[PDB]
Each structure stands twice: as structure tokens, then as C-alpha cells.
Symmetry: D2
Subunit: 304 residues, 4 copies
């Protein structure tokens, strides 16, 4: 995604470095649970976490991994902490590590989109109150309340998408816990603020990703609506809405299937970052913006 | 839609006759509320409702509306309804503040709530067939695993579609009877509240001229994710099904216009093809695909240390 | 497709009855070629064609086929002419018959879309000439010339789509002519105004259908442009443009694969009929519609 | 786009540096035409062109444009170009009737002609690999047929993509230097004709402020059909390839905004993300997928009475 349509928070969240740090946390929390089960020496996971706190994974780690090209990553992780750790990375698959980390990242990304949505929601509330008794014959305020009601529906949809995607898969080769006790997954889930994936195969099911992307595409349409109604930088918000519709189509195709889903490396980071960018741009525009006898009853439905 | 890929329930639900019957119920229930407010003579609303139970609007009523439309859509409909009931006293009391959109959007939301009920019924059928195959195959070894686990993966995905479709049904299940600009200037909120309750809907807490189209887009999006879960079963079974795969492609195509309609339907109810095509077609294809998939699943009939526990998360 | 957005020409072309009549023509022309090769009694194909000319396949034929539910169709065809014909229907597959007939129908449908496009092209030419020296400071005429140039590009794209789709497959079970001499296909192609499909499998390749649908989606966008620029019944033309974009996506997915492509029964008839409807509606709107020193050089590029 | 799914040729072509170099060529060639018309001093255009050969615009030039943009895009670019050449005499002679869109759309069409050349080169590589596998397998029996025929089906489909991509390249290969409203009021048609010829393009026979976006949509549509033919090979080989299937899904997604842009880009060149994302991404993914597919085909290595004749339609 080109820098003009990026937020600093999304650029950091979706960087190489941030993915490796999340991978490392999954590995460390898994080791911690194996330790409770007698399968890794006491103190090995505390040592990896202490060392990550002291020397966070950065560009030099990421370049170093791009050379050895999860074997490359685990070698680079053991080498970059100078450590035993190598032998104990035991039953988990690549997909367990990578899909769990991506879920964690997507939970964070949706938290950023919700934070900005709340800003747009607050600006529309304020505009709707300010213009509650402004004549237009109707209240000019009702228009902003219509936007608010749509964004509140988007909030509900984005919170449900966040609950659906917030799962940890640490289930081993075919997803039946033969090589990794369910306790490992339960522990890693808990440490990441996720819940255990109640039924995984080799992968997390992609109806979960599709609900996230569909929530973003519906949010884009509501951003578009405000922008088209305001035109009383809106080529920008309509542009983002078209990309969000485009990005949804590969996620809908990914439902049926392994890894045939390039696709997620592009669409999840790009749609979450365009959503964040667009709501921030829309908040700025709303902050700098300019027969009635049932208006109070209508406002009351929104506690206004 | 082609008779080959319809269900009798969706063919009836989305028929013209069915639409006019729902237009008529919306006018009737509105009349009842207007009666209670002393704006229509006592016993009229109840006489219209008894006439529409006694002589259901059918094909002959639909032809009359079509003829009348050649020469004007709700003028044509209200005039056919007056003439078909045989009571021109009703005629003055229709549209008494209600817009075309109040009737058409309200009736379409009631039809969409029903259509989603039919899809949820058939999804329940698909869920029970998947519980049956998972129970049958719980101890069946395959490649070194329980063959049954695959059916539980399908089941979990369709239980999420079920939650998604129940939320879409709650979101779409709104009545708009708010008059010209949606501010109740010419129609007191009690009319909308009474018609909503009589239809099993809730009031649209804020309409413009139209119900907001993020509600419609949530429905079409739920159906497209469902289509993917239907497709996923058909593909994993391939290892009939060309049909289920086909429906999934059409459901993805039909979603695109609903996503464009969000920004765009309040500048269509009357002059645009988009919703007349995609909402009956997407709901019909979903119902059809779930029925066909249910038929196919019903036709079908040491390393496993954790299978009992996995099955217990599903209550199996 | 609902009647409001149908043309009479497209309703007839895409009816059950019209499909059966095209099926029967493919069968008859195949018999004619087998006859030249000594494989069917002389005069059998002339007898089937004579009988079809005299009693064209109609509702009573179509209902009669919907009962016996290409076995049903061939029985119903032999029964409905009271005839030998049964035994001689020999090497051709269902797909040979059905895919060849659908190509023929799509060539006709594209001929209808081109006929209406020429009407829109003529109206824009006329409007551009009428307003060539009308000031707006620029010629008000140039706007109509921009529309014309786009529609002329659509014409070129729709004529190329018509050439790509205009193929006949009569190649037998796996497409290698083992059970049907290439002469049969060459003869049927010639009789239908098609060319032989130079390389078929069990089916005609679907990049051909996808080019047709993509041409229609690009035509829809240009119809949309005129409608949005005119708003100086256009919810109708913008609506059709959204359906044409939607219909393209299943045809793009159909490229890769057998018959997993319901999909074509819906999208080919619906997109060709919405295209025909929309251009006819757009022609009617254009017919009833209201610094300069290089205008003549610009008009000259279009021979105006 | 991610380095994993790029080619070195597309990474260079779509770089900022590459865009600024093409902006600079468009300004230079326009200056030459303005010189011939006696509106810029003799030898200036030729001195700018020799300076841009002697000191190619690189990363340091791009940083300067970015800094300058923080404080205004073509003011920032024309000011960086004046300062980087060391000649403020040039500065007065830039934008001398040319719009931002004349430069930006013209440069983007020249980059799109190159990008399509790279895709066509790599498609030629895929075609030769398919001719090789068809020749190898001409007499190889499979299931009762020639195994080689399958490669000829792939080849025929990619020969159609080739025709489609050459037509898309002709359609996009237009120069717009027509000034404010596209009527040449402030820039004589000889400027556009001279820059077109110097770029290997033809004049846009009728522009507004912008090149019409059916041209861009034809390009994106050709790439999405190509993606389907790439996908079809990967799926029929499955019977690596998750990668080629992945690219086909993104190419279908990227097309949707280009189809919406037709009605819609002349009310974006400057304030919208859509083309900055989809045109470099779709052309890069196509080039990448064709290169990967070519590597894989190169790695790979009585009822047949009509095979020689079928092969002869392909000249094999």
C-alpha cells in the first residue's frame, strides 16, 4: 500500500518486523505451556521473552531472515538470541504459528478501525446536536443522525468480525491435537487475548476472514455515502470504497478449498489500512465542516 | 429465475401476487392505526382486512395492476385495490401521508425477513445432515485421523452462517412509515410502530425517503459467505456439486451491486432493476443450494485420543 | 429477467422454444453431413428440416420436453415429427449440440446489441453536429463526440467478442474427432455462419464467454457515463451498469476448471438482454434531449 | 506490492523514479514542439534532454519532490526539475498550456504500454513452453487420447490472451496534451502529435480533462481473462500452483474498481488511490504469474487418427 493512503499505526502493525515479533510471541507462549507439561527445560520461555524485551525483533532481524530464505525464522530467532531454544520449536505446524499470529494482528487492526470509527461517530453526534433545530422543511441535523445510525451498524458488524477472527490454532498437522495437547492452544490463546479455534483443519476456516473483509466493504460503502452526500478530498474516500469492494472478492473465493489463499498478504493489510486511513480522513473533514415537532422523539432513539 | 433452480416456497414468496398481498397488508395495518387516531371511519380497516382474507389478491389482481401501470406504480396498485374490494370509501384513506417508499420498502423488508426464515430452515436441515455424518464417522479412520472431523468443520462453518443470517434478518426486519423526508411531519410515529408490530418488524429508527442500504448489503454479504461454505462442502466432497459451485459464483456476483447500492440508492426503488433482480435471485439460489446440498448429504452414508473432546464442543 | 428490463427481441432469442429450435438445427445440419458420408439414409435431414419449417418447435414442444425430464429432447423431436431420425442422433455429444447452439444464439444476441449501439452512435453523431458551434468557453458538441468515441470503442470490442464466440464444437467425447469426422463440424459451422472451434475439449473454452461478458461490462460503464453526465430514467441505466459488473465475475471464474459453469443459463441471457434494453432506453433519451478554433480539426478525426 | 510477488522489471517500471523520468520526457518532448513553434529559445529542449541522459532522475530527485509536495504534485515536480537541472530558464517554459493531467495521463499510458510489453514477452515464454510440452506429448497415450492435446488447449487460450493484450496495448497507447478542457485552446495539436510520436504513442483523438477510462478498463479486463487462463493451467496441472490461483483472484478483484472508474474518473488523477494501486499491481501480478507459470512448464517434461491435423492448425 502506497504511503499517501497509509496510517503510521497500520504501517507498523503490518510491517515484516511486527509479524516476526508476533510469531516469536506465539513460539514463546507455546514453549511456556510445554514447560508446564515437562517437555521443555524450566526457564527456557522466560529466557526467550526476557531477551525479546531487551532486543526487540527489528530490520536487522527481518533482513537476516530474508537471507536464510519457518525454518529460516526459527534459526534466525535462535542465532539472534545466541541460545537450546532450537530443539524445542515439537508438534506445532507453520500454520499454527502464522495463522495464530495473523489473527492476533487482525484483532489489533480491527481495534484501530473501531478507535477511528468512534471518532467519526463522535463528530456525527456533535454535528447532529449542533444542527438539531436548524431548518433546511426539516432538521438539517437528521442527515448526520442517518450517517451516525449506519456507522453504529458498522461498529456492531466490526465488533462481531473481531470476535469471529479472534481465534488461536495450535492443533498440529491435521487439526486433531495428536501431536500437541489442547492445553498448549488454550494457554497461547489466553496469552494473546484470543480464544481457542473450536475446530481447525491444517488452517483456520476462511469464512472468518470473509466476514472481516465484508464488514470492511460495508463500512467503505457508508464512508462513500457521507462523501457523496457532503458534495451541499472526497474522490479519495470514494476511491477507497471501490478498493474495499475489490479486496472482498478474493476473500469470498478463499472460503472454499489450504494455502491457495499471495492473496491474504495483500488484501488483509491493504483493506484494514485503507479503512483506517479513510475513517481518519473522514473524521478530519467532519471536524472542519457550513414540521420539526417529532425531531426530539427521533433524537431520543439515539439518547440525544 | 429458471424453474430448475427455484424452490416452490421462493417462487410463491417473490411472485407479483405475493408482493401485492404484502403491499395490501401494509396499507390495511396503516388504516387500523389511522382509525385508532380518528382519521378513518370505524370498522373500515377491519372490513378491508376481512375482504383480503376472503378474496386473496391473485393473478387477475396482478394483471389489473399491470394494465393500470401502462397508463401511469402505487397509484395503479391503490386504484386496483379500491376496485377489487368494491369500496371507493377506502380510496380516500390510502396514501394519507404514506409515501410509495413507505409501502414498497416496508413490504420488501417483510418479504426479506420471510426469505431469510426459509434459508435458516433449510440451513437447519444441512446442519442436522452434517451432525448425522460426523456421528456416523466419529470412529472411521482416514488419512491418520477421524474422517468424521471433516463434517464437524463443515458444521462449525454453517453454525457461523446461521448467526450471520439471524443478525442479517434482525438488521433488515424494519418498517418505514415516516412520510416524505422520514421526519413523520405528515404521519405520526404510532402508525409505523403499529404496522411494524403487526408485521413482526420493529420501527426503522431513522429513515430518509428510503431504508438505508447497508441493511440490504449485510443480507447479500451473509448469503455470499454462506455460498462459500456451500461451495467448500461441494469441493471437499468432489475428492450435483457443479450446481452448488455455480450458485456460489452467482451469490458473489449479486453482492457487488448491493455494495455499490449503499452510497447510491438514496440518490431507484421505482426506476432501477438492481434490487428486483438481486434480492429475490440471491435468496432463491441460497434456498435452492441449501436444499440440494441437504439432499446430497442425506444420500451420503491411538492418533484419535482427542476426538471425543472435539466432538463434545459440538455437543456430540 | 423481469419483463420491465426485457426487449421483445431478447425474450424470443432466449426463450426455451428458441433454444430447442437451435438444438434441432444443429442436429439436422449434422445429419446432412453424415448423409454425405454414407452414415444416414439419403433424404433424412431434408425430411427433418421440411417438417421443422412446417411445424416450428413452440410451447407445446417445450412443455412436452419438460415432461420426459438430450435424450428427452431427441425422443420429443422424433415423436413430435412422428418419424428413423431417433437412431441417427452417432458420435456427437450433448455439449457439441448445446455449446454450438448457445454460440449461435450469442452471435445473434451480439448482433442485436450492435444494432442498438449503432442507434446510440447515430444519435450522438447528430447531437455532436447539431451543437458543433454551440458555445458552453468550448463547443457543447465535443461532450457528445467523447461519448461517441467510447461507443465506437465498445463497437470494436463487441465485434471482436462476436468473432471470438462464433465457433461450432462437434468434436465428440474428448474433442479429438475420434467418433465424428472434422467434416461434420466444418459443415455445421458453415450452415450456422460459425467457424470450427480450432481446439475444443468436452467443452468450448470459456475465455471466449469471458471476453463477451467483459465487453458487456465495459459497454455498461460507458452507458453509465452518459447517464451520469446527462444529470445538465437514468437510475435505470446506472442500475443496469451495476448488474453488468456483477454478471462478469462468475464468467471470469468459469474460465478455470467442465459444467461447474446454472451460471451461463443466468448470466449470458441476462447480460445480453440488459445491454439491449439499456442501449434502446439510452437511444430514446438522446433522441428527446436542451477558443473554438480547433473544433473543425477534432470533428474531422470522426469524419464530421 | 511485496518483493515475493514482483519481478525486477515491474519494480523498476512502477518505481517513483521511473514515473518522474517519464514526466520529465513528456515535458522535454513538449518543449521540442514548443521550440519548433518559436515559443521557447533555440537549444533549450535539447539541453534539458542531454541533462536527463547525463544525470538520470533517481532516488535523491524523488525525495526532493516528496519534500516539495509536503508544502503544495506537478508544481513540486516542475520546481524539483528546474533545481536538479540547474537552469531556471526552463521553469518559465514548463506547463505553458499543458495541464497536470496532460503530463500524468500521458506518462501513465507510456508506462502501461511498457508494462503490457513485458506481460506479452513473458506470455511468449509461456506459449513456447506449451508448444514444447504439446510436441513432447503428441504421441503420448492418456485417458483414450493424446495427452499432448491438453497443452494445445492451454496454448490456444493464451494465443487469444495475446491478441486481447495487443489490442489493450493499442487502446491504452494514447498521448493527451490538449490543455484545460481537451479542445487545444491553449496548446496547438502539433505539441500532442510530436510528443505522441516521440513516446511511440498516437494522439488521443478526443480527451476531456482526462483520457477516457474505458481504455484502462479494457487493459484490466484483458489481465483478468489472462489470470483465468493462468488459473486453468494450474488447476489442470494440480490433477507453485496455489500462487498462480492466488494471482487470478487478485486480478479479478482489481478489475472491479476499473469498471466503476469508467463513469466516474472524469467526475481522481491526483486525489484518488484507485489507479496508483490497481494498474501497477495488476500488471506486476500478471508478469510475475506468467514468469512463475513458465518456470513450472519448463520444469515439467487408432483413436488418434486426427491428432496430426489438429496439431497442424497450430503449425505443429
Amino acid at each position: 500500500m502506497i504511503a499517501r493512503y497509509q496510517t503510521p499505526e497500520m504501517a507498523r502493525l503490518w510491517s515484516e518486523e511486527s509479524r516476526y515479533r508476533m510469531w516469536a510471541r506465539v513460539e514463546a507462549y507455546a514453549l511456556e505451556a510445554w514447560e508446564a507439561l515437562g517437555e521443555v527445560p524450566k526457564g527456557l520461555s522466560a529466557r526467550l521473552l526476557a531477551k525479546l524485551e531487551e532486543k526487540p525483533l527489528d530490520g536487522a532481524f527481518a533482513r537476516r531472515v530474508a537471507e536464510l530464505e519457518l525454518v529460516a525464522f526459527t534459526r534466525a530467532l535462535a542465532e539472534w538470541t545466541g541460545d537450546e531454544v532450537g530443539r524445542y520449536l515439537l508438534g506445532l505446524t507453520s500454520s499454527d504459528i502464522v495463522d495464530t499470529a495473523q489473527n492476533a494482528l487482525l484483532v489489533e487492526a480491527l481495534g484501530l478501525v473501531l478507535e477511528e470509527l468512534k471518532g467519526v461517530e463522535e463528530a456525527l453526534k456533535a454535528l447532529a446536536l449542533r444542527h438539531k433545530h436548524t431548518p433546511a422543511p426539516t432538521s438539517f441535523g437528521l442527515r448526520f443522525l442517518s450517517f451516525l445510525a449506519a456507522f453504529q451498524r458498522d461498529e456492531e458488524r466490526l465488533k462481531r468480525a473481531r470476535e469471529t477472527i479472534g481465534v488461536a490454532m495450535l492443533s498440529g498437522s491435521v487439526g486433531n491435537y495428536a501431536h500437541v495437547p489442547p492445553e498448549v492452544e488454550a494457554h497461547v490463546a489466553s496469552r494473546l487475548g484470543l480464544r481457542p479455534e473450536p475446530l481447525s483443519t491444517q488452517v483456520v476456516p476462511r469464512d472468518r476472514h470473509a466476514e472481516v473483509m465484508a464488514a470492511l466493504a460495508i463500512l467503505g460503502g457508508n464512508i462513500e455515502r457521507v462523501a457523496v452526500e457532503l458534495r451541499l478530498g472526497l474522490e479519495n474516500l470514494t476511491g477507497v470504497a471501490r478498493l474495499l469492494r475489490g479486496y472482498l472478492f478474493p476473500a469470498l473465493e478463499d472460503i472454499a478449498l489450504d494455502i491457495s489463499h499471495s492473496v491474504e498478504r495483500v488484501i488483509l493489510p491493504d483493506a484494514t489500512t485503507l479503512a483506517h486511513y479513510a475513517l481518519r480522513r473522514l473524521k478530519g473533514i467532519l471536524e472542519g465542516l457550513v414540521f420539526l415537532r417529532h425531531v426530539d422523539a427521533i433524537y431520543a432513539r439515539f439518547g440525544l
